[PDB]
Write a protein that binds this ligand. Sequence first.
Ligand SMILES: [Zn+2]
Ligand SMILES: [Zn+2]
Length: 57
Amino acid sequence: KQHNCQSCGKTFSSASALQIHERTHTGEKPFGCTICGRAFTTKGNLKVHMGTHMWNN
DNA sequence: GGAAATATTACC
DNA sequence: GGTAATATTTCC
Ligand SMILES: [Zn+2]
Ligand SMILES: [Zn+2]
C-alpha cells in the first residue's frame, strides 16, 4: 500500500517517512540543540548540526 | 514489513 | 556553508 500526503499529494515509502515529510507543512521543529538553541525537523539533521559544535582538533 | 538511522540531494 | 527535505540502507 501507499502513504500519500493529504496536503501536497507527494507519496512516501512508509507511514514513518510520510510523517516526517508532513512536518514540512506544519512548520514544527521537534529536535533542539542544547548548545545554541536552534531547532531542527529531524533527529539526523540536529545530529549533523551538532558536529559544527565540535572543537574536534 | 517498516521504523530508524544515514547517506544524499535540494534548497536557500 | 549549512539546513531542509527525501532517498537508500541498516536494524528490529
Ligand atoms: Zn505534503
Ligand atoms: Zn547548536
